[PDB]
Target: Major capsid protein
Amino acid sequence: LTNSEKSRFFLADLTGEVQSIPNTYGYISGLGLFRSAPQTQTTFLMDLTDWD
Amino acid sequence: ISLLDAVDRTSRKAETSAPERVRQISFPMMYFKEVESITPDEIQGVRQPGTA
Model:
């Protein structure tokens, strides 16, 4: 019971809100493939070795 | 009533008194009527002044 439309002396009912939230996808992040490798420097190096 | 008048002792004359007078009157009275009405349109969805 807030107020009527175009009149401050009658009442109407604010029944409720209708929230409309955006949809997000999380399949790949849920797969859990990547392993966390914390580090201190801004760049890192790797060695590639092959007897062949 | 009136004032007595002197008369003689041997003439034996005297004076009398007049009778009364009776009348009758009537009275009409006054009438006043007031009418009101109550309708649901006066209560339906009307805000009470001084209240939110």
Observations:
- The radius of gyration of chain B is 38 Å.
